[PDB]
Amino acid sequence: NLDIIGKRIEKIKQEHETSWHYDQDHPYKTWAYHGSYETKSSMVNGVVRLLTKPWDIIPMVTQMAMTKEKVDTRTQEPKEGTKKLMKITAEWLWKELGKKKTPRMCTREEFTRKVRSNAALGAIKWKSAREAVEDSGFWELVDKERNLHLEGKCETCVYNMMAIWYMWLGARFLEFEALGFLNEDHWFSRENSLSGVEGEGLHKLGYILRDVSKKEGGAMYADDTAGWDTRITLEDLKNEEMVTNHMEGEHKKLAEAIFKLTYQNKVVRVQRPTTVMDIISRRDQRGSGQVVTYGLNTFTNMEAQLIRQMEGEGVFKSIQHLTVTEEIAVKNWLVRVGRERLSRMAISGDDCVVKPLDDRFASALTALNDMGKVRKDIQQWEPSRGWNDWTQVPFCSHHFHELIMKDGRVLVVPCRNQDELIGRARISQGAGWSLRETACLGKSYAQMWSLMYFHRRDLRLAANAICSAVPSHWVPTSRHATHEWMTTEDMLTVWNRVWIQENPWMEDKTPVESWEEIPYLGKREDQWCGSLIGLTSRATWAKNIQTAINQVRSLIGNEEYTDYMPSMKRFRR
Ligand SMILES: Cc1nc(C)c([C@H](C)NC(=O)C(C)C)s1
Ligand SMILES: [Cl-]
Ligand SMILES: [Zn+2]
Ligand SMILES: [Zn+2]
């Protein structure tokens, strides 16, 4: 307790010596409260909304632009049988992930190149992080903490709640220096991890789920966890920490300090309106950078799902206690079939799809519930409902269609309800957007649609309209996945590269010569997934689209524009 966190708490105490009041009516039960002190939205993208008029009267779209008791919860300690299963599996999984990779420190140079590329780090003297990385004074502050961690102590690595846990750039750098390698060197790539999809891209995920469907076995299971980050136990944090067993030198010590001082023993500042700032501590639950969070969520999810698979195959009888011979059976299962069982999964942080050996998996719930990974929207002991068709499985907020081109070649495409896509593209975050910056964000959404959602009639039409309304040479902007749409290259050339040339599931590499060779879903299947095709509002929009494009061109002014509407058959004469 207070020996590891007290030094951080002491320093905050003094900075607000005038206001250090202990509010006896503090709402925390699970969080350990220390003291208080005195302290004191989604905007619409006008370019995308003017070019999607029919959606102005659809509440699922228009409500998206308008407008905890899970963090303050406790998770019971797992049984001894469960703790053994997790330790054996985690030991085995780090070794497997480490067979073709070498842990290493990430550099100030690498960090500095990420801040100048507008990468989301979650950071709180210096206005922006760019100024701080340029100032040696910042690196002087980083050095002091760096030497504190080598000494096994912490002073400034404190979380700020808002769920997102922002920290000071110095603590974020020290996290990146010690654990950035997991993402920077692609540990959770499909090639390395077999279950992972880090770096894949939305265009790949459907092909990956269809490859899992090809395995002999039972239903496809896709159970969501209720509040995954809140269910991470101190036992889970200990199993994650075993990556340090593969390290050496300074790196081993720096990594051991991140896990010990900032992950397994936290300090957090939360704003309570009654406005004051509360300084609370807790050892369990997930509270890290979003990028390290992603890789450790993937690791711990892979572990939990291999154990659920062991339970269904009868590898162990009870979570109460593993016998000596069950330990050897579990290790032997992992050595003999572990890699095959990893390939039966697609795991993206807390999100999973599993095609187990058979449907015994559906009712194998004792280890999953005892690890604290309780399923969302089903009773604790009711068996999981599986999917019989890979095209119906949810994964990473999508489902996937099999779409046959006029020339016979097969595309596997990502999809989701079209109201969600249009509603998201109509929102921008933050202040001080120029008309040009707003336009360039609309262009990013439009190019994303031409590449990923070209098969949805409304989105190919709206994408063509937005690209016709925004000056041809303006560069799309965006104030685990691949962003091929962020470019000024011709979108037909990018489509050919992504879906044909670089597609490992497409044997015939014949280029497509025009957008009219590129198919849509069935009219009925487009309506099922939210198309307005068939409505009078939509027909009038499509027919009069040049009027909408011209409205937006008149607002932006006398710039160079291209007409992309004749790429579609109906505007081709
Ligand atoms: C299908 C998508 N994949 C990723 C990674 C997206 C990002 C977050 N969003 C964007 O690039 C928008 C500004 C268009 S959308
Ligand atoms: Cl189904
Ligand atoms: Zn620290
Ligand atoms: Zn669909």
- The CA–CA distances, whole Å, from 557 to 27, 53, 500, 554, 564 equal 54, 21, 37, 5, 18
Pairing assessment for the beta strands 268-272 and 159-161 based on DSSP bridges: parallel
Angle ∠(107,114,154) on CA atoms, nearest 5? 55
> Is 149 known to sit in a ligand binding site?
yes
Counting ligand 1 atoms within 8 A of each CB, the residue from 418, 478, 485 with the most, and so the one to mutate, is 478
**3-state percent helix, strand, coil for the chain, nearest multiple of 5:** 50, 10, 40
401 is in an annotated binding site: yes
End-to-end Cα separation, the chain, in angstroms: 75
Please check whether residue 283 is in contact with residue 234, taking contact to mean a CB–CB distance below 8 angstroms. yes
| Ligand 1 atom 14: residue of nearest CA | 445
Q: For 239-253, give the DSSP string.
A: HHHGGGGG--HHHHH
- Determine, yes or no, domain membership for 49: no
Which of 393, 411, 445 delimits the end of a domain? 393
Query: Ligand 1: which atom is nearest the Cα of residue 448?
Result: 14
Instruction: Return the structure tokens found at 76.
Output: 């019971």
Token readout for 239 is 């199993």
For residues 108-144, one letter each, b for 16 or more C-beta atoms within 10 angstroms of the residue's C-beta and e for the rest, the string is eeebbebbeeeeebbbeeeeebeebbeeeebbebbee
Q: CA-CA distance, 23 to 64, in Å (whole number)?
A: 37
| Residues 26, 154 share a domain | yes
Pocket of ligand 1 (CB under 6 A): 202, 444-445, 448, 452, 478, 481, 483
DSSP, collapsed to helix, strand or coil, labels residue 121 as coil
Residue range of the domain that includes 357: 79-100+190-233+289-393
CA distances from 442 to 57, 219, 461, 536, 571 (A): 20, 40, 14, 25, 22
**Domain identity same for 156 and 294:** no
Same domain, 423 and 460: yes
Q: How many angstroms separate the Cα of 420 from the Cα of each of 52, 62, 240?
A: 13, 10, 35
Let me know whether 458 and 361 are in one domain. Answer: no
Number of domains in the chain: 3
| Count of beta carbons in the 10 Å neighbourhood of residue 449 | 25
399 is in an annotated binding site: yes
Closest CA to 478 of 521, 447, 525, 441: 441
| Same-domain check for residues 131 and 161 | yes
Q: Which of 482, 508, 368, 406 is nearest to 78 (CA)?
A: 368
Q: At what angle do helices 290-312 and 234-241 cross, to 10 degrees?
A: 100
User: Strand, helix or coil at 519?
Assistant: coil
Distance CA 447, CA 487 (A): 9
Q: Whose CA is nearest to atom 5 of ligand 1?
A: 481
Which residues sit opposite 281 in a β-bridge?
A: 32
Cα–Cα distance between 122 and 171 in angstroms, integer?
Answer: 11
* Same-domain status, 525 and 409: yes
Which of 395, 398, 422, 448, when mutated, tests ligand 1's pocket best, judged by the most ligand atoms within 8 Å of its CB?
448
Bridging pattern class, strands 42-44 and 399-404: unpaired
Q: Would you say residue 58 lies in a domain?
A: no
Q: Is 56 within the bounds of a domain?
A: no
Same domain? 24 vs 132: yes
- DSSP bridge partners of 38: 276
Q: Closest Cα to residue 127, out of 119, 117, 114, 138?
A: 138
Could you tell me the CATH number of the domain that includes residue 2?
3.30.70.2840
Do residue 173 and residue 317 come from a single domain? no
- The amino acid at residue 485 is W
Of 367, 393, 419, the one marking the end of a domain is: 393
Of 377, 393, 409, the last residue of a domain is 393
Atom 6 (ligand 1) nearest CA: 483
- Is residue 57, in this structure, part of any structural domain at all? no
Q: Which residue type does 134 have?
A: E
The rounded radius of gyration (Å) of the Cα atoms in the chain is: 26
The neighbour count for residue 32, using CB atoms within 10 Å, is: 15
Taking the C-alpha atoms of residue 251 and residue 202, their distance in angstroms, rounded to an integer, is 34
Specify whether 383 is located in the same domain as 447: no
Per-chain residues with Cβ under 5 A from ion ligand 4: 415, 529
Q: Strands 159-161 and 165-166, how do they pair?
A: antiparallel
- Rounded Cα distance, 189 and 181, in Å: 12
Is 90 in contact with 239 (CB distance < 8 Å)? yes
* Whether residues 158 and 251 fall in one domain: yes
C-alpha of residue 154 to centroid of ligand 3, in Å: 4
Alpha-carbon dihedral 492, 497, 503, 508, rounded to 10 degrees = 80
With the most atoms of ligand 1 within 8 angstroms of its CB, the residue from 483, 484, 485, 487 to mutate is 483
Please give the resolution of this entry in Å, rounded to 1 decimal. 1.7
528 annotated ligand binder: no
- Ligand-binding annotation for 377, yes or no, is no
Q: DSSP character for 116? A: T
Q: Would residue 65 count as lying in a domain? A: no
564 shares a domain with 419 = yes
Q: Give the count of alpha carbons within 13 A of 130, CB side only.
A: 4
Residue 447 CA: which ligand 1 atom is closest? 14
Calpha distance 104→243 (Å, rounded): 11
